[PDB]
């Protein structure tokens, strides 16, 4: 109950985060392209995950700890770094979002 609320607060912080230029960094990460739209993603990435899926997993009580939530957020960001070119905006945004997650978890949970 309190855990579910901690998780929703943390993920909401990550999703709503805007950089100093006003850009909501999460936007591209909410929903993966389909298999038909981007078959090469699914050829490369073994364990696809997006923020929509993480929200599903929170809603359905699938993460039993903040550690388990963190593992999926880090997976998402790792997949983004794997697929996208180093130095691309999406690659760089995924690094920022890792930090935003860790700060949100420090702030909300401690
Ligand atoms: O890498 C991810 C997405 C990369 N895409 C999304 C945009 C930019 C790049 C190529 N894109 C396409 C390509 C085809 C159709 C729709 N979007 C990604 C998205 C959600 C969660 C994890 C991810 O790695
Ligand atoms: Zn429920």
List ligands, each type once. the ligand O=C(/C=C/N1C[C@H]2C[C@@H]1CN2c1ccccn1)c1ccccc1O, zinc ion
Q: Indicate how many domains the architecture comprises.
A: 1
Instruction: Report the biggest beta sheet as strand number plus sense, adding barrel if it closes.
Output: none
Q: What proportion of the residues form beta strands (DSSP E)? A: under 5%
Number of helices: 5
Fill in the CATH topology. Answer: Histone Acetyltransferase, Chain A
Assign an overall shape.
globular
Distance between the termini: 17 Å
Helix content: 55-70%
CATH class categorisation: Mainly Alpha
Q: What class do helices, strands and sheet pairing give?
A: mainly alpha
CATH superfamily: Bromodomain-like
PDB class: hydrolase
Keywords: SWI-SNF complex, chromatin remodeling, Brg associated factors (BAF), transcription, hydrolase
Assembly: monomeric
Entry title: Crystal structure of the bromodomain of human BRM (SMARCA2) in complex with PFI-3 chemical probe
Write the layout of secondary structure elements.
Blueprint: H1 2-16, H2 39-44, H3 51-59, H4 66-83, H5 89-109
Helix pairs in contact: 1-3, 1-5, 4-5
The structure holds the ligand O=C(/C=C/N1C[C@H]2C[C@@H]1CN2c1ccccn1)c1ccccc1O and zinc ion (ZN).
Residues 28-29, 32-33, 37-38, 50, 76, 79-80, 83-84, 90 line the site of ligand 5BW.
PDB class: hydrolase
Keywords: SWI-SNF complex, chromatin remodeling, Brg associated factors (BAF), transcription, hydrolase
Assembly: monomeric
């Amino acid at each position: 109950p309190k855990l579910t609320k901690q998780m929703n607060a943390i993920i909401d912080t990550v999703i709503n985060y805007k950089d100093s230029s006003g850009r909501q960094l999460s936007e591209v990460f909410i929903q993966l392209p389909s298999r038909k739209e981007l078959p090469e993603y699914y050829e490369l990435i073994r364990k696809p995950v997006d923020f929509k899926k993480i929200k599903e997993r929170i809603r359905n009580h699938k993460y039993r700890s903040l550690g388990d939530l963190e593992k999926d957020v880090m997976l998402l960001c790792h997949n983004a770094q794997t697929f996208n070119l180093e130095g691309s905006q999406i690659y760089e945004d995924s690094i920022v979002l890792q930090s935003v997650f860790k700060s949100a978890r420090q702030k909300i949970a401690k």
